[PDB]
Amino acid sequence: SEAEAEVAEIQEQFQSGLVTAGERYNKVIDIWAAANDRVSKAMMDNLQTETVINRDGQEEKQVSFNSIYMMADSGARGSAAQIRQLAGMRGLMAKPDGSIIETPITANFREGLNVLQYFISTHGARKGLADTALKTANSGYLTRRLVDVAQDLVVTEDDCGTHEGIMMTPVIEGGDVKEPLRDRVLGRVTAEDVLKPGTADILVPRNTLLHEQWCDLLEENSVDAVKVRSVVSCDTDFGVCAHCYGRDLARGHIINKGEAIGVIAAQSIGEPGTQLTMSSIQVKNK
Amino acid sequence: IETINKLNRISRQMLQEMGREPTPEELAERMLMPEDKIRKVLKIAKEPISMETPIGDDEDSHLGDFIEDTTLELPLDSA
Amino acid sequence: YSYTEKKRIRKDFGKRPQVLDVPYLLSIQLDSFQKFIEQDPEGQYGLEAAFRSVFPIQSYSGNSELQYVSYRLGEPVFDVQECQIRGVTYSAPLRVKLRLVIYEREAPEGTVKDIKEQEVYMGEIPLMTDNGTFVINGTERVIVSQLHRSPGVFFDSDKGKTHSSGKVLYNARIIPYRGSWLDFEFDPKDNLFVRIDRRRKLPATIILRALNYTTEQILDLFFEKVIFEIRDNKLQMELVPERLRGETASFDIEANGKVYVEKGRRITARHIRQLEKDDVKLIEVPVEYIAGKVVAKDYIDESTGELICAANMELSLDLLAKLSQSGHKRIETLFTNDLDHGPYISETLRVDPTNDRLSALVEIYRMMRPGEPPTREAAESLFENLFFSEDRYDLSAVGRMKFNRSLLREEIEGSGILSKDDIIDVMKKLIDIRNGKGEVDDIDHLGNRRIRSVGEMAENQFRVGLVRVERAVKERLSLGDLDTLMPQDMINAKPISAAVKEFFGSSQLSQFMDQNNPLSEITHKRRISALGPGGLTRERAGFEVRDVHPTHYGRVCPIETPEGPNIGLINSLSVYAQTNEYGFLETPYRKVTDGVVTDEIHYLSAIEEGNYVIAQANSNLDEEGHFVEDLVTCRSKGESSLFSRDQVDYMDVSTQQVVSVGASLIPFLEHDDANRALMGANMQRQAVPTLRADKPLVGTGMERAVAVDSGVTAVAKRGGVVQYVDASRIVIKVNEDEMYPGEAGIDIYNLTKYTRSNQNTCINQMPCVSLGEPVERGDVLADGPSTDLGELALGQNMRVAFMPWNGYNFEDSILVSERVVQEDRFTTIHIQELACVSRDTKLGPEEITADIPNVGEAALSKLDESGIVYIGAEVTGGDILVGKVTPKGETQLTPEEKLLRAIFGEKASDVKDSSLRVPNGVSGTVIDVQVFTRDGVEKDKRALEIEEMQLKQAKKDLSEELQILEAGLFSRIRAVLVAGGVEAEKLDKLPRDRWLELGLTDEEKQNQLEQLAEQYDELKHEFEKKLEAKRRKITQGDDLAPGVLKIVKVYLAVKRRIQPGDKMAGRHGNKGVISKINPIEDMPYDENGTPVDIVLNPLGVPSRMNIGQILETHLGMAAKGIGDKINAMLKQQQEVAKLREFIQRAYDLGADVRQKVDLSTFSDEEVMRLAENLRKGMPIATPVFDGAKEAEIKELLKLGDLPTSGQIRLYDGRTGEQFERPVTVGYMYMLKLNHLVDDKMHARSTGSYSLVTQQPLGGKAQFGGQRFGEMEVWALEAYGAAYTLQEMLTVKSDDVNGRTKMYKNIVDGNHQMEPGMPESFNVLLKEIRSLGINIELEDE
Amino acid sequence: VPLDGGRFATSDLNDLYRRVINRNNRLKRLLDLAAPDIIVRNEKRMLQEAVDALLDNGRRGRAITGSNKRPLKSLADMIKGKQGRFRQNLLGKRVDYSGRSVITVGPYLRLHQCGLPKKMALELFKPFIYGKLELRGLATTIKAAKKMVEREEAVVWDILDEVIREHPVLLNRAPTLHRLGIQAFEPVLIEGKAIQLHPLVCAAYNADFDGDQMAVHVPLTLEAQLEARALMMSTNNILSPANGEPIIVPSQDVVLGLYYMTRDCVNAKGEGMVLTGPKEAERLYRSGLASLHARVKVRIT
Ligand SMILES: [Mg+2]
Ligand SMILES: [Zn+2]
């Protein structure tokens, strides 16, 4: 009712002619998103700890026994967005244009959808579903080309006796860590000797498997830069060495020579992708 | 060939007269020759039907895929 | 209510008073095909349109012609059912009257030279059933409506083709019903261009020259005038004020003595307004303003006669001098506003090399016939043929309509041929849209898309057949004789019937019917596609056509379209829809007047809709006032919004018309997601009928009319009294009033017993009635495969509860009890067909006989004399059905078996076995056999035993008929004597025949005596003629192929039951496979020991959101409970009055229930039977978007004395305890599916192999090996199983030495591998070498 | 070749060869006759035309057709595209000793197991049975053997169970994206026509019991059998090569049971007594005396 009155106000302002339509548009849609967030707050506070249960005392509340919420918190099935679609208003809806409609949904599945509310759910569902049908072409095509390139590559040697390669440094950018140097080094083999901020303290003789104990060891030290004998940098004609590739992940050890890498790669990269299409500067902390 | 010409030409007129097609009985009569030769020629008049045709209405089965080879042997028979 | 309603009422909570009742659903097939036949005199439809449009035809010279008269059809020779049985098309004769009028080329047109007015048969035509299928070779088939871009014209514009430009390019296109296309376009350089059917580009203006226009006339048409006057030295000029708009003054633009606009100044709308108000048209101006302006029309000096300037040429100042000196103080010019009035045409002329009409025709001729040395009339005739000959260009007056409206004419109609006005008007609107006025149009709007039903396609192929005729007609007219060559001595009916047959049997729309379910039939008939001819392609089309467009509302269901590559293309028809006569669509709407909703109806089309304003059916009407609330949900313009009350034009009829039928049946859809409803209504079609017909309790109300309008049931043609009853036929006597006066009016109905469906299922019928009761007309007298008392029933309702169970319902799987299996209730039938053909060989005939060599009497114990099975058998893999044997060649033998029959002396015959047997894995019950044989060969004895018995059956079935029909008549023959005296007991006791000699008198009664003589005479006689044609139809041999001497056919019955692997589901997408059947004791159960039948895993409800099954479940638990109450009332056997009170209290429960029904209207036994038919559960109607509510569900469950939450403490059976907490419980209506493991499972040891590559096959029907794709190689490439790979590459597929060697090493125990080489490789080498290449190997 | 009803069937090449030979022979005729060069030219354009069509029909110009109006598959099409030898019939092959069916759940199973229809395996492992019956001599020859296996005697089943032991078998679901889409299990025989499966490895298959169907292959030779037990085995593979995450992540029902069990309410009962260990706790709840979810003191080791 509140937001309804708001759009009545912005309406009559546009009737005065003060406001444009685009300004009006972004304004009204923004208040709708706000209201949606607020119903999300109200419902989530009204389920998870709604259970007030006394025990040898007046009252106290705890995480609820609502089976739907237990299914949610488990990670089994459901999520706050979906549960919102069950209890609260379910978002806004883009018509097939890529536009974003002005008058959102009020009711839910428990209350009952309206005729047009259903008719408008249509566009989004059929659209994204049409995409579901029609992205595996690109996926299998890409995967097929990748496998096609990466046929011939197999480890030909145990150690190529080769020299330094790529540098691993973290990908912290924009915020905090997104790939720890812990993870990036994990299972890789050093380019060369490596030391500590307490300096000139070697731990690798130019090549070691850097399993989790080495990685914690260098979490203690404040190091933030490593070098690695990469798959690229290896010099072996018609293949690579076992060291430069490093860990066979599904084994948990160094890759045995003779194992076929390229298919593992193209599968590894194309397998996920089917689903997965679908002023100022301000210091934060000290 | 000539026999086939006479046949398929006469069958049209018989179709006018009858309003329906002729039988090898009626047609062996009209064709002046006995049913054996009629039936024979009718058995001869057929063409081949092009293995690369899509008997799968979808591009799934070009007819040659369906075909079995009963020429070689079966390993159980050999044993 | 009605009788079939009195016995089993379905409650309703719908509230919206329906003004309309549904229409007949299969109307469109009937009406379309009807138009294809119906003898239209004038507004030609189909046939007559093709005759008229083609005939008359005259000779290649101009002397002789054939002339159309009329047509007539024969009744078909074969009835429906012999065409089903025989494997024969159902069709009717065709007969055209034709008049050969011939003209003397001696006389001018002295037509009296020859008349041959005779008649001609040519070509059968299939017909339509009363239900919509076409029987074809004994197959019920359906042919599907199509949807495609209507003819006319269509404007578009691509955005940034040259994306470097980032520029807009407009284009127009003309698309006729018949003939060639036409494309107009622009370029980055703002030049109009043409290409036909996408031939090359051409400078557009060329065509206008070819159309006999000059540059003068062209620019007169396109360009408006700008007139200068050189008054004695200086330039004045005329100026409308709104010409310098958003424009800039080049000089000081001033007036009489007054300055409006200065130099470098914009001619603002202020100065347009001063220039307007001040009556200022002429303005003094500089001469230099001209230089650059283009002349409009050719100017000379009347003294010279020489072009001082040709037309469309830029002006100068020496030419201002020389013009005015030549006598031009008037210079018309071309208006040119680069903003608004662009130089498109003129630039196109300056690029166009063509100057005359003729060269334009030459370069068109050269675009389409490249190279060819051009000639005049070849090119004139070419162009004029393209778009100005009736033969090769027709618009469809539909197309003429859409075209005219696209140019804003008034004329709907016109020609199927173009005019120059049309072309140039199109070019004008095009360039207008290039300037900015108007808009390009859209594909996805229905008003551009047209339906094409059967009769129109039939018209098309019919006309094509007429052309196939027409060529040889002329060739045989002009050359051969005239007076003697009869009209049908030229005609050949083969291309025509070959065409009709071809379409009915080879086209994408022609296909088998989906007989598994009446729903699936009717919805396979209410299908719409954009594929086939005149349509689209999967690999080509994109997302835009697939997606929804808002005009689908009330016309096309958005909820029923597959999930695969055909997601958007196919789509089904909406409920209250119809077709525009032109082929477009329409939809009902209630008209809204003065706020009052008018109860009349109007069928707004695809285009009228958006202009008006339209309200919803959800509107809470103010009781014949207006919309109650101010901000009424309404819509227009391709979008919805909130509007006022008197402001409205139209309202929706009902809460449904957006939907199709399938999604009209899913209840509580409003509480569901569209995805899972899509899947629900899709799988709602793939059902199988159960052995019984268990209704649904949770209804919608549409169930009845679908159970009727599939035509599968019997229908009371004329209501009356049930005369005879059986399990195979019914006789009704017709009510006296309904009984027409001539006819005795005793309708009889023969019913179908266990019979194959096209998907190999049971088709069957049963009476839903007793004997000796009245019938209200239109009632159902017989149920079908999936029906009950006139309502649909695709499956069975039963007990459900949501909880996990020990991992057995892990990911959507199902767990189920044994009790269901003891009641057979999901058991179903799969009738099957099997045949044996007796062929004639190079060596001799195949022979059907019991005798077979090397056979034991075990098998032969069940073959009768002729080598054929006795009916009633029950058989299994290995058994023999039909002993067929084939005369054999001879053999090249081995020394060993040679020695062995040198030992035992045993021998072969000169014959081989070819018997018909059960295929392995199969078992079942023989129930019927049929035999077909040539007219000319002996009927193998059993055939005589079959057809003679088929006469025993048939002639009995008719004897009964005539015996009854005639026995009624035999009252007359009694009584009519008796008028004219009385023989009160001298009549009766002595034998009935000998009353004609009893009491007699003169004048009027001798005619009576001989009237009865006539009656007797007729009555025997009709029987004899009946018997004649009938019996010869039974005995007449069969039109078979050559080589085919006789055929047997065998019908089985198999009775498949539920097992793990047999999928099941409901009507919300709530799928599930089975994983186990659970004994009754290990089940969950309740305090009262009533266990559960099905258990489900509610993990998959929230993320799927298919919530209606919950509410449905609650409601089901309610309804049964009431039945249970009544059941207590019956065994305790209470009384009438308590039932009366309870039941009427049950009906009048809801808030604002639309229906109101009283029981004191009904009599006692009606209350009895109705309480007795409800005891299993009180069935309810939940209309789809006018659903019921939790208040009503819970009120009802409180009437059930149940937990309002429908959620009870459960006790486990294995441990005897209680679970932790309650669990939801109630009755779902549930279904079985054709995706059965029995039909999917398949293994393969070693078997057949193909012919070119010698690698095994695929398909269980071919004992198929499974495919090992490239993916499945890439995996093993990952692991490193080189040996497993090589194994699958050589022995299992191609290496024959390897496979045989391997089998042999195996049976010797040795599990050892040897390779060879795959044959497909060396094949490839041979092919390459066929391609002229020395491919070869470097042997070690 | 023929078919049953006297009909014949052919490959499109023969038409092309016929056209070629007709044209060459007619040309030779016209060359015996010194006929005009114009018809020579025309016959040769016809020749080069038909050759070029044989090597690729729809390449040089508008296409050649049989009566169907769809074109004539030339040679090169058989080497080309999907329908060529490579992608269809050479890198991909139909297979002997294989099968498929519907799947359902095996909840009781252990990781190395696959529920298996009898009859399916009976067929798949036939010549082993035959070798073992010639071994035992119950069927002295293979006609007797085949008749027994058709008669489905008792020793059929005991010997089936005899051979199947320690004999792994491969499982495969489409689309075989990554190497964990295809695995080697051990067989377990069951009286049904539907495979059961170890639920945790549904995830590597991306598989659910919504009507899915899986395929079965057999490692005949010993080396493939050992590779199966050692490389394609379900025990060797609990981690991806993409990332070292557990791909044995308990999906959706088991996890609910855990999160329900291990929980710390306040409310039910039995709060604040003491246990010597887990077992008498099991005595409590299997009696039903404690909450399953209640923080209480215990001893552990
Ligand atoms: Mg699935
Ligand atoms: Zn290396």
From Swiss-Prot, chain B:
Subcellular location, record wording: Cytoplasm
Annotated S-S bridges: none
Location of region: Sigma-70 factor domain-3: 2-78
Subunit structure, as described in the record: Interacts transiently with the RNA polymerase catalytic core formed by RpoA, RpoB, RpoC and RpoZ (2 alpha, 1 beta, 1 beta' and 1 omega subunit) to form the RNA polymerase holoenzyme that can initiate transcription. Identified in a complex containing RpoD, the RNA polymerase subunits RpoA, RpoB and RpoZ, CRP and DNA. Interacts with Rsd; this prevents interaction with the RNA polymerase catalytic core and with promoter DNA, and as a consequence, promotes transcription from promoters that require alternative sigma factors.
Function: Sigma factors are initiation factors that promote the attachment of RNA polymerase to specific initiation sites and are then released. This sigma factor is the primary sigma factor during exponential growth. Preferentially transcribes genes associated with fast growth, such as ribosomal operons, other protein-synthesis related genes, rRNA- and tRNA-encoding genes and prfB.
Written domain comment of the UniProt record: Contains 4 domains, connected by flexible linkers. In the active conformation, the domains are in an extended conformation, each making extensive interactions with the RNA polymerase catalytic core.
Family membership noted in the UniProt record: Belongs to the sigma-70 factor family. RpoD/SigA subfamily.
Protein's name in the database: RNA polymerase sigma factor RpoD
Gene name per UniProt: rpoD
First and last residues shown, out of full length: 457 to 535 of 613
Curated annotation (Swiss-Prot), chain C:
Superkingdom of origin: Bacteria
InterPro entries tied to this protein: DNA-dir_RNA_pol_bsu_ext_1_sf, DNA-dir_RNA_pol_bsu_external_1, DNA-dir_RNA_pol_su2, DNA-dir_RNAP_su2_dom, DNA-dir_RNAP_su2_hyb_sf, RNA_pol_bsu_bac, RNA_pol_bsu_CS, RNA_pol_bsu_protrusion
UniProt-listed SUPFAM superfamilies: beta and beta-prime subunits of DNA dependent RNA-polymerase
Bilayer-crossing regions: none
Reactions catalysed, as given in the entry: RNA(n) + a ribonucleoside 5'-triphosphate = RNA(n+1) + diphosphate
Residues modified as N6-acetyllysine: K1020, K1198
GO cellular component labels: DNA-directed RNA polymerase complex
Protein family according to the UniProt entry: Belongs to the RNA polymerase beta chain family.
Summary of subunit composition and partner proteins: The RNAP catalytic core consists of 2 alpha, 1 beta, 1 beta' and 1 omega subunit. When a sigma factor is associated with the core the holoenzyme is formed, which can initiate transcription.
Function as written in the Swiss-Prot or TrEMBL entry: DNA-dependent RNA polymerase catalyzes the transcription of DNA into RNA using the four ribonucleoside triphosphates as substrates.
Stated name of the protein: DNA-directed RNA polymerase subunit beta
Curated annotation (Swiss-Prot), chain D:
Positions with a binding annotation for Mg(2+): D208, D210, D212
Section of the entire sequence shown: 253 to 553 of 1407
Gene name per UniProt: rpoC
UniProt family annotation: Belongs to the RNA polymerase beta' chain family.
Assembly and interaction partners: The RNAP catalytic core consists of 2 alpha, 1 beta, 1 beta' and 1 omega subunit. When a sigma factor is associated with the core the holoenzyme is formed, which can initiate transcription.
Protein name from the UniProt record: DNA-directed RNA polymerase subunit beta'
Top-level taxon in the UniProt lineage: Bacteria
Function as written in the Swiss-Prot or TrEMBL entry: DNA-dependent RNA polymerase catalyzes the transcription of DNA into RNA using the four ribonucleoside triphosphates as substrates.
Source organism per UniProt: Escherichia coli O157:H7
